[PDB]
Amino acid sequence: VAYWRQAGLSYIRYSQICAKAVRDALKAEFKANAEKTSGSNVKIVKVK
Amino acid sequence: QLDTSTWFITITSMIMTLFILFQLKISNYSY
Amino acid sequence: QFQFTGIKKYFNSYTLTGRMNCVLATYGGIALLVLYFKLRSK
Amino acid sequence: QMSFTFASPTQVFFNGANVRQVDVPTQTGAFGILASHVPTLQVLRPGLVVVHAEDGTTSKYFVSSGSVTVNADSSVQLLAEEAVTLDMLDPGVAKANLEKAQSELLGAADEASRAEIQIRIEANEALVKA
Amino acid sequence: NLFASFIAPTMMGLPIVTLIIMFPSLLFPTPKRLINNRTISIQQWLIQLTSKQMMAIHNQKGQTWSLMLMSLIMFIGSTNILGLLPHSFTPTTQLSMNLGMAIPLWSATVFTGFRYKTKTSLAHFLPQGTPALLIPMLVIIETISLFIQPVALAVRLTANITAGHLLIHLIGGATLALLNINTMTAFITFTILILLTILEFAVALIQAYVFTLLVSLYLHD
Amino acid sequence: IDTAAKFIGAGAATVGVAGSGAGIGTVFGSLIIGYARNPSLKQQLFSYAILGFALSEAMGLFCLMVAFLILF
Amino acid sequence: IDTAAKFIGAGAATVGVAGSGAGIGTVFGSLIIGYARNPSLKQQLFSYAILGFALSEAMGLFCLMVAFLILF
Amino acid sequence: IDTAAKFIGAGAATVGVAGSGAGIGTVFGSLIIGYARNPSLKQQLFSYAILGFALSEAMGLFCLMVAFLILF
Amino acid sequence: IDTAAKFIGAGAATVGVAGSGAGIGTVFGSLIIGYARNPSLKQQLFSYAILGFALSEAMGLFCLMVAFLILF
Amino acid sequence: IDTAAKFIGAGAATVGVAGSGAGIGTVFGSLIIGYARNPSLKQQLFSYAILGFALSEAMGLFCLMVAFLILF
Amino acid sequence: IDTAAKFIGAGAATVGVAGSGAGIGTVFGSLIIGYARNPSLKQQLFSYAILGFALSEAMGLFCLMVAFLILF
Amino acid sequence: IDTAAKFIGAGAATVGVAGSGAGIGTVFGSLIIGYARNPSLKQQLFSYAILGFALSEAMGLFCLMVAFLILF
Amino acid sequence: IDTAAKFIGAGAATVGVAGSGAGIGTVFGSLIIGYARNPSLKQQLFSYAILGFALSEAMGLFCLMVAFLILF
């Protein structure tokens, strides 16, 4: 148990945050990997 | 000091109080 | 009087084993007798 | 006496390669893997992983998160969400991000959002070391 | 001098040890209505809270002993706390009643175990599982270990309270003497600091005394 | 004749407090490491620590009683 | 003089009880860290702790009994 | 004068049993932590524990016997 | 013959403070390793360490006070 | 006289056995924890245990021989 | 006789350095394993170690002071 | 009769080396455990190990020196 | 008279050798738990221990030699 746990954060959420933080630090020349990641292409439709 | 061979009264009184007074008062409880 | 009937069940039911105070009485009597002998010896 | 596979969702670095040892900065302290290590299963934390080749050279990579698995034999699978090299990084932008993340702590109101901010500052402070 | 309070069975023309030892019972009024005042509600809540934490192990026969154990713990705890008063006389200091408390219950447990479960009660001497080939050596170890329980159970209670009171009295004498020579409030600071520990050290002893007997009873039940 | 023997016997007997000090040091030391495992249940482990310290103190306190007995 | 020898021997005899404190401190220190690791097997852990505390007390009280016997 | 020598020799030799308590505390503590990891293997762990406890208590008993011999 | 004999008795009662010199080391040592795995929660750890150190040193001051009393 | 010297020397020398007991305790404690962690390595683990036990017992036997020499 | 009864308390008062040595050994040892767990937190570890060693040695030197002051 | 005091005082002050002998083992023991988990940083672990050993041996040498001074 | 003091001092000097016996068990104990992990890395582990055992026994022997020196 760490501070992120018992705070409403899951391991997947923490992995997303750390991966985003690492990808930010890259040089502007190599920033084309944001196109490769592009994690936002799935919409959510609930039952109601 | 604690060993003066007058141990009859204390034992009798302790037995009396422990085995009569406290059990009877503690029995009248609800939970 | 009116208190025996309150815990009569306890006394005749479960404290049968705990009612063996003979060991304590014998030990106390022996200790007192030895102390009396020592005091009388002076 | 080892089969090391350092894979990523995009590319592959090793596939069954034999190396003498690998050092991993996992959770709950550091680690060292050699010969027939005892079986273990642990997740990673942002840090630097070094692999010592049979010749003697040391290759370095930066890992964000993933999983580690050492099985009964000398087979190790290290699957990481991220795998990058320092040569494509800017230390200055790292320091700027850290500087902003510092004030983000006091900017936060609720403990969950501040927990996210704390993860941010933890990642930023971890990477600026090297 | 120092050994004055201990060797003093309530000095009077007629001994009044009975009055001193029966006094604590006049602090627990018995309930008589569905809703009562504040002073007894706390008592019954405390009794309920303590009961569910200790007697929740025995299956059916140990539930019968519940009243005796609660009475015992309340009695010892009430006797010990009242002794912190400036000129009180703690009956638990005397070894006589401590010796008259341990033996009956221990004997009750030990020959209750043999009456119903003689086959298993005889087996507990030999440790469970195979202890290599050292059987005769450890057989004589655990049987002598059996007899020491009441002696220690009485002696620790007889010793710790006397040690605490001796410390308090000596520190008080020390802080009195240093008034004439120089000025030092460090000693009264020591006294006030130690008083917290002496105040909270009694209830731990009550709990340990009751818990050991609980464990011993559960073994043969 | 006897005063010197009683005083030196009391002075020798008063060295039994080392074990209690070591025990209480050990127990509290284990508590901090155990707490660090998971911040939850801190009150339970604290209760265990307090019980252990009190038990060690009881097991080591009756040494000084013999010293006071020999003194008086 | 013989009584003085008995007194000094009794005073020097009690110093062996310090072993009980260290053993008690160690056994209890293990229970907390072990429980913290696996908060499932409370009963077996406590039974083993109680067994250890019961067995460890024998030596110190034995030495104290020897001192009491030699003094009187 | 010989009785004084016997008394002081007995009072000095009785100290050697102190180490038995520490060893007993050590072995029992190890069993607690050991059981936490592999409760399945609790059968084999005891045999080791008993062996150690018996060995340490035997050493303590040997020292006590030497003390009794020097007393008599 | 009196003050000279009390000199050794008072000097031999200042060994109990040595046992207080190990519990403190064990306590602070546990603090170092305990927080090493959990870098946060420093304040509560520090408070617990301080409590343990104070308790052990008070146990030592007990023996020191007994030694002070023996002289006079 | 010589007899009192022999008695005191024999009594003081025979106390160097606590170290052996403490050593035996630690060795067995490590063995159970070690096997508990990594099974299927009993040969080496048992091997190291024996060596340690033999070393500690020899260390104690040296002091026993010293006591024998002092007495005679 | 006064000189004869002196220098024996002084000799018995210098045996109190054992606990300080044990504690000074225990602290530095805990630092080694702690450092190996997490190399990042080094300066704080070293500060804690230094504080612990200084406090332990300060506690230990009290016995030497008492022995010297009794000696002269 | 002062020579007897010198001899027994020197004999009593010799017991001060137990702490160093017990402390030495924990440092070297801790080193083996720390090296096993992280072999790479083999160089740094030593400086601390040898620092602790030097401190412990100095603490023992102090008691040796005071015993020699008393004996001469 | 001086001969009796010589015997008493020689007997009392050997007490301090208990430190080595305590440390050997801890040293070999570390080897068992250390070998439990990364077993193949064994040569360096054994080397480290040998040094600790040698140093502990050297300290023990250094303590002992004063007994023979004072005896003759």
**DSSP string across F3-38:** HHHHHHHHHHHTTTTHHHHHHHHHHHHHHHHHHHH-
| Contact exists between G and A (3 or more beta carbon pairs < 8 Å) | no
Q: Is the dihedral of CA F35, F36, F37, F41 positive or negative?
A: positive
Task: Determine the residue of chain E that is closest to B25 in CA distance.
Answer: E30
How would you label E108-121 residue by residue, b for 16+ Cβ within 10 Å and e otherwise?
Answer: bbbebbeeeeeeeb
E strand or H helix at F1: none
How far apart CA L25 and CA M52 sit, in angstroms, is 6
Q: Report yes or no: A38 at the D interface, CB cutoff 8 Å.
A: no
How far apart CA K26 and CA I19 sit, in angstroms, is 14
Q: Are D97 and D124 in contact (CB under 8 A)?
A: yes
Q: Are L27 and L49 in contact (CB under 8 A)?
A: yes
Please state the length of chain D. Answer: 130
Q: Do D29 and K38 touch (CB under 8 A)?
A: yes
φ, ψ dihedrals at L38, nearest 5°: -130, 80
Q: Which is nearest to J19 in space by CA: M16, I21, K23, H27?
A: M16
Token digits for E108?
Answer: 């009750």
Please state the length of chain H. Answer: 72
Task: Determine the residue of chain G that is closest to F64 in CA distance.
Answer: G14
How would you label J29-50 residue by residue, b for 16+ Cβ within 10 Å and e otherwise?
Answer: bbbbbbbbebeeeeeebeebbe
Which residues make Cβ contacts (< 8 Å) with residue K10, sequence separation at least 6?
A: I11, K67, K70, K71, L9, L13, L70
How far apart CA G22 and CA G5 sit, in angstroms, is 30
Q: What is the CA radius of gyration of chain L?
A: 18
How far apart CA F62 and CA F55 sit, in angstroms, is 12
How far apart CA G18 and CA H18 sit, in angstroms, is 7
Q: What is the number of H-type helices and E-type strands within chain I?
A: 3, 0
Q: Which is nearest to L23 in space by CA: M46, K14, I21, F27?
A: I21
| Three-class SS state of K48 | helix
Token digits for M45?
Answer: 């582990």
Instruction: Please measure the distance between the N-terminal and C-terminal CA atoms of chain K and give it in whole angstroms.
Output: 17
Q: How far is K33 from chain L (nearest CA, A)?
A: 5
Token digits for K49?
Answer: 């170690």
Token digits for I60?
Answer: 């030592």
Q: What is the CA radius of gyration of chain D?
A: 17
Q: Is the dihedral of CA D80, D82, D88, D91 positive or negative?
A: negative
How far apart CA M65 and CA M71 sit, in angstroms, is 10
Q: Do J52 and M28 touch (CB under 8 A)?
A: yes
Please state the length of chain C. Answer: 42
Q: Is the dihedral of CA E65, E68, E74, E79 positive or negative?
A: negative
The torsion of the CA quartet L27, L33, L39, L45, rounded to 10 degrees, works out to -20
Q: Report yes or no: H54 at the E interface, CB cutoff 8 Å.
A: yes
E strand or H helix at D49: strand D47-52
Q: Which of F50, F55, F61 to mutate to test the interface with E (most CBs of E within 10 A)?
A: F61
Q: How far is D11 from chain I (nearest CA, A)?
A: 33
How far apart CA E176 and CA E170 sit, in angstroms, is 10
In this structure, what DSSP letter does residue D84 have?
A: B
Strand partners, D58: D52
The torsion of the CA quartet E202, E206, E212, E214, rounded to 10 degrees, works out to -160
Instruction: Sort out which chain F residues have CB atoms less than 8 A from E173's CB and list them.
Output: none
Position K37, amino acid: R
How far apart CA F14 and CA F66 sit, in angstroms, is 8
Residues of chain E numbered 62-91 and touching chain C (CB < 8 Å): 64-65, 67
Instruction: Sort out which chain J residues have CB atoms less than 8 A from M35's CB and list them.
Output: 34, 41, 44-45, 48
| Contact exists between E and C (3 or more beta carbon pairs < 8 Å) | yes
Q: Are E165 and E191 in contact (CB under 8 A)?
A: no
Q: Enumerate long-range contacts of B13-21, CB under 8 Å, 24 or more apart.
A: B13/E17, B13/E18, B13/E21, B13/E22, B14/E21, B14/E91, B14/E97, B14/E100, B14/E101, B15/C21, B15/E100, B17/E21, B17/E22, B17/E25, B17/E75, B18/E71, B18/E72, B18/E75, B20/C3, B21/E22, B21/E25
Which residues make Cβ contacts (< 8 Å) with residue M45, sequence separation at least 6?
A: L32, L35, L36, M31, M34, M35
| Contact exists between M and D (3 or more beta carbon pairs < 8 Å) | yes
- Neighbouring subunits of B (3+ Cβ pairs under 8 A): C, E
How far apart CA I24 and CA I17 sit, in angstroms, is 12
Q: Report yes or no: M10 at the J interface, CB cutoff 8 Å.
A: yes
Classify residue D108 by burial, with Cβ atoms within 10 Å: 0-12, 13-18, 19+.
Answer: middle
Q: Do E71 and B2 touch (CB under 8 A)?
A: no
Q: Are D111 and D68 in contact (CB under 8 A)?
A: no
CB atoms within 10 A of CB E126: 12
Candidate from E145, E151, E155 with C-beta closest to G54 = E145
Q: Which is nearest to F18 in space by CA: F54, F52, F64?
A: F64
Q: Tokens 């305990």, residue?
A: I34
Q: Tokens 């009295």, residue?
A: E169
How far apart CA H68 and CA I18 sit, in angstroms, is 30
How far apart CA I45 and CA I36 sit, in angstroms, is 11
How far apart CA B6 and CA B12 sit, in angstroms, is 12
Token digits for D88?
Answer: 């494509």
| Contact exists between K and J (3 or more beta carbon pairs < 8 Å) | no
Supply angle C-alpha H7, B4, E3, rounded to 5.
80
How far apart CA I24 and CA I46 sit, in angstroms, is 13
Q: How far is I54 from chain E (nearest CA, A)?
A: 12
Q: Tokens 């040091």, residue?
A: F25
How would you label K6-41 residue by residue, b for 16+ Cβ within 10 Å and e otherwise?
Answer: bbbbbbbbbbbbbbbbbbbbbbbbbbbbbbbbbeeb
Token digits for D108?
Answer: 């936060």
CB atoms within 10 A of CB E195: 13
Q: For residue K51, how far is the Cα from the chain centroid? A: 12
Q: Are H10 and H70 in contact (CB under 8 A)?
A: yes
Position D86, amino acid: L
Q: Are H26 and G27 in contact (CB under 8 A)?
A: no
Token digits for L9?
Answer: 């005082």
Instruction: Sort out which chain L residues have CB atoms less than 8 A from D42's CB and list them.
Output: none
Task: Determine the residue of chain E that is closest to I62 in CA distance.
Answer: E167
Candidate from M9, M56, M59 with C-beta closest to L8 = M9
Q: Enumerate long-range contacts of M40-49, CB under 8 Å, 24 or more apart.
A: M40/D34, M40/D35, M40/D36, M41/D34, M41/D35, M41/L36, M41/L39, M44/L35, M44/L39, M44/L42, M45/L32, M45/L35, M45/L36, M48/L28, M48/L31, M48/L32, M48/L35, M49/L28, M49/L32
| Three-class SS state of H20 | helix
Instruction: Sort out which chain I residues have CB atoms less than 8 A from D31's CB and list them.
Output: none
Classify residue M14 by burial, with Cβ atoms within 10 Å: 0-12, 13-18, 19+.
Answer: buried
Q: Are H19 and J21 in contact (CB under 8 A)?
A: yes
Please state the length of chain B. Answer: 31
Q: Do L48 and K30 touch (CB under 8 A)?
A: no
Candidate from G11, G19, G35 with C-beta closest to F10 = G11
Q: Where are the alpha helices (DSSP H) in G1-72?
A: 2-13, 18-37, 42-71
- Helix E95-116 and helix B8-16, axial crossing angle in degrees, nearest 10: 60
φ, ψ dihedrals at J59, nearest 5°: -60, -45
Q: Is the dihedral of CA E139, E142, E144, E146 positive or negative?
A: negative
Position G29, amino acid: G
Classify residue L45 by burial, with Cβ atoms within 10 Å: 0-12, 13-18, 19+.
Answer: buried
Q: Which is nearest to D17 in space by CA: D41, D50, D53, D44?
A: D53
Q: Which is nearest to E91 in space by CA: E79, E74, E99, E102?
A: E79
How far apart CA M71 and CA M3 sit, in angstroms, is 9
Q: Report yes or no: D48 at the L interface, CB cutoff 8 Å.
A: no
φ, ψ dihedrals at D62, nearest 5°: -115, 130
Residues of chain H numbered 25-44 and touching chain J (CB < 8 Å): 25-27, 29-31, 33-35, 37-38, 41, 44
Q: Which is nearest to D72 in space by CA: D3, D26, D6?
A: D3
Instruction: Please measure the distance between the N-terminal and C-terminal CA atoms of chain H and give it in whole angstroms.
Output: 15
Q: What is the DSSP string of chain L?
A: -HHHHHHHHHHHHGGGGHHHHHHHHHHHHHHHHHHHH--TTHHHHHHHHHHHHHHHHHHHHHHHHHHHHHH-
Task: Determine the residue of chain E that is closest to G61 in CA distance.
Answer: E152
| Three-class SS state of E38 | helix
Q: Enumerate long-range contacts of G38-43, CB under 8 Å, 24 or more apart.
A: G38/H36, G38/H37, G39/F41, G41/H35, G41/H36, G41/H39
Position H34, amino acid: G
Token digits for H22?
Answer: 């520490």
Q: Report yes or no: L51 at the K interface, CB cutoff 8 Å.
A: yes
In terms of phi and psi (left: phi > 0; alpha: psi -120 to 50; beta: otherwise), the region of E7 is: beta
Q: Which is nearest to J35 in space by CA: L27, D68, H43?
A: H43
How far apart CA F30 and CA I34 sit, in angstroms, is 9
Q: Are D79 and D70 in contact (CB under 8 A)?
A: no
Count how many Cα atoms sit within 13 Å of the Cα of residue E38 in the half-sphere of its side chain: 0
Q: Do B24 and C7 touch (CB under 8 A)?
A: yes
Q: Do F64 and I62 touch (CB under 8 A)?
A: yes
Q: Are E65 and E210 in contact (CB under 8 A)?
A: no
Q: Do L38 and D30 touch (CB under 8 A)?
A: yes
How far apart CA G51 and CA G45 sit, in angstroms, is 10
Method: cryo-EM
Q: Are M4 and J2 in contact (CB under 8 A)?
A: yes
Instruction: Sort out which chain H residues have CB atoms less than 8 A from E137's CB and list them.
Output: 54, 58
Q: Tokens 């520490």, residue?
A: H22
Position G58, amino acid: A
Which residues make Cβ contacts (< 8 Å) with residue H26, sequence separation at least 6?
A: G23, G26, J22, J25, J26, J28, J29
Q: Report yes or no: I33 at the D interface, CB cutoff 8 Å.
A: no
How far apart CA E221 and CA E202 sit, in angstroms, is 29
φ, ψ dihedrals at C8, nearest 5°: -60, -40
Token digits for E90?
Answer: 């703690």
The torsion of the CA quartet F64, G54, K23, L45, rounded to 10 degrees, works out to 180
Q: Report yes or no: G15 at the F interface, CB cutoff 8 Å.
A: yes
Q: Do J20 and H15 touch (CB under 8 A)?
A: no
Strand partners, K55: none
Instruction: Sort out which chain G residues have CB atoms less than 8 A from F23's CB and list them.
Output: 21-26
What resolution in angstroms does the PDB record give?
Answer: 3.0
Q: Report yes or no: M41 at the D interface, CB cutoff 8 Å.
A: yes
Residue spans per domain, chain E: 1-221
Q: Which of E2, E14, E21 to mutate to test the interface with B (most CBs of B within 10 A)?
A: E21
Supply angle C-alpha H31, H35, H37, rounded to 5.
130
Q: Where are the alpha helices (DSSP H) in E83-185?
A: 95-116, 118-123, 135-147, 149-177
| Three-class SS state of D4 | strand
Q: Are B2 and E7 in contact (CB under 8 A)?
A: yes
Strand partners, D44: D26
Parallel/antiparallel/unpaired status of strands D47-52 and D58-63: antiparallel
How far apart CA M42 and CA L6 sit, in angstroms, is 50
Q: Tokens 């900017």, residue?
A: D107
Candidate from J1, J25, J35 with C-beta closest to H23 = J25
In this structure, what DSSP letter does residue D66 have?
A: E
